[PDB]
Amino acid sequence: AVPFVEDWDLVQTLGEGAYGEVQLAVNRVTEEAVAVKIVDMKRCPENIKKEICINKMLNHENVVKFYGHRREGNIQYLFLEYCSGGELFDRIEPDIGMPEPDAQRFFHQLMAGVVYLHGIGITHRDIKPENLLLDERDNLKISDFGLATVFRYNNRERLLNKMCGTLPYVAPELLKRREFHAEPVDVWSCGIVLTAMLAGELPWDQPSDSCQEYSDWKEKKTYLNPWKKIDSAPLALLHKILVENPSARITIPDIKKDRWYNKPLKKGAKRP
Ligand SMILES: NC1=NC(=O)/C(=C2\CCNC(=O)c3[nH]c(Cl)c(Cl)c32)N1
Numbered sequence: 001a002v003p004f005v006e007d008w009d010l011v012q013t014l015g016e017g018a019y020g021e022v023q024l025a026v027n028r029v030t031e032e033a034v035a036v037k038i039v040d041m042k043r044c045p046e047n048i049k050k051e052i053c054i055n056k057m058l059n060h061e062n063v064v065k066f067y068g069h070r071r072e073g074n075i076q077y078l079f080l081e082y083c084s085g086g087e088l089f090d091r092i093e094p095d096i097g098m099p100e101p102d103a104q105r106f107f108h109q110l111m112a113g114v115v116y117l118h119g120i121g122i123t124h125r126d127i128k129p130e131n132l133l134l135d136e137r138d139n140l141k142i143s144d145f146g147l148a149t150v151f152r153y154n155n156r157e158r159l160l161n162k163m164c165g166t167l168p169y170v171a172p173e174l175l176k177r178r179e180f181h182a183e184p185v186d187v188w189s190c191g192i193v194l195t196a197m198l199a200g201e202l203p204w205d206q207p208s209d210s211c212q213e214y215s216d217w218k219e220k221k222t223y224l225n226p227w228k229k230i231d232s233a234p235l236a237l238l239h240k241i242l243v244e245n246p247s248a249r250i251t252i253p254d255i256k257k258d259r260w261y262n263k264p265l266k267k268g269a270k271r272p
Contacts, residue, residue: 005029010036015087018126018146019048024082034067037078047146048076054122054145055080062113064133064143083141085134088197092129096200100231101266103197106132108261109140110190115252117142121152123182125164127189129196137269151182160185168192172207172214173246184246187255191241198234199226207244218244233260 008025015022020039026032039048055066055078065081088106091098110132117124124131125147133141147164151157159179171188173180195203203226204213216224227235237260240250255261 002029008034008036014082017144019044019051020076020078022080025079033082033084035064035080035082037080039076039078041074041076045076051144051146051148052076052078054148054150057120057122058117058145060113060116061139062109062141063116064141080143081135081141083133083143084136085138087130088132088134088140088193089129091134092196093200097196097198097229098200100198100234103194103234104260104263105266106140106197107190107194110142110193111252111255111261113140113142114186114190117148118183118186118252121150122148123151123160123186124148124189125182125185126166126169127186127193128166128169129193132193149182157181165189167206168202168204170207171246172244175206175208181246183251184249187241187249187252188246191238194234194241195226195230195238198231199229201226203227203242217242233263237261 005027007028009028010023010025012024013021014024014035017037020037023036023038025034025036041048052069058066064083067079067081069079070077091102097103114124114127124142124145126144127142131142131144133143135141149160151160160182161179163174165174169189169192171180171185174185192202203217204211207214209215217227222228222235230238237255237258240258241255243249
């Protein structure tokens with residue numbers, strides 16, 4: 001049955017995940033390219049088990065596909081969809097961002113991915129441009145479920161309490177409340193991601209009053225960067241997403257109803 005078809009050559013290092021190193025693997029026979037996350041369990045053999053477990057639950061066009069996994073001694077292997085376009089992080093130009101239409105399309109795809117995840121009761125907990133990958137047609141794919149967890153099971157929501165994520169992207173309730181709903185936390189990070197795509201800079205080191213840029217936002221001083229670089233329509237959406245009270249924060253079903261979210265901006269990919 002086609003010899004050598006299970007042999008892959010590691011041709012280059014693509015990056016680093018929350019729990020491992022990622023290599024580009026090319027099939028010896030088909031030349032099919034996949035990404036292989038390699039994790040030396042000599043650190044934590046369980047954290048990686050959970051990630052593999054969450055990946056097995058997923059199947060969506062906006063989520064990095066999980067092909068399988070193999071354990072070789074004290075080395076865990078995760079075969080994942082290769083996204084030749086790289087990290088969204090690298091499409092954001094420092095202090096400028098990117099064309100609004102591109103940002104809107106990536107945001108539409110990010111939302112699609114998050115709606116899907118939240119739909120099966122999984123929260124990512126570390127949404128940031130570094131973890132949002134682009135395939136060859138610039139389709140966005142959510143990656144790295146190393147910090148992901150189940151927040152709804154048997155139709156019962158479980159409140160979270162683990163401080164998790166990346167400070168610039170984390171919701172303020174993680175810093176001031178002991179327990180919190182999972183979903184608004186992911187919405188918030190998507191909000192910070194939109195700000196980065198549209199302004200090329202993160203608004204604050206963290207969402208605490210001790211942080212001046214953050215109090216400035218709560219005061220509505222949008223005449224300052226990064227907000228002044230953002231057009232009124234998407235800024236209006238950001239005023240709904242970046243709300244301190246998680247209960248008053250806009251939900252995804254409503255983001256989908258937002259004026260900017262539905263504004264025709266981007267033409268489809270050019271055709272011959
Ligand atoms: N953060 C992260 N988790 C992953 O599984 C992951 C992958 C694996 C998913 N596919 C990729 O093409 C990829 N490119 C780069 Cl750069 C990284 Cl790193 C990856 N990146």
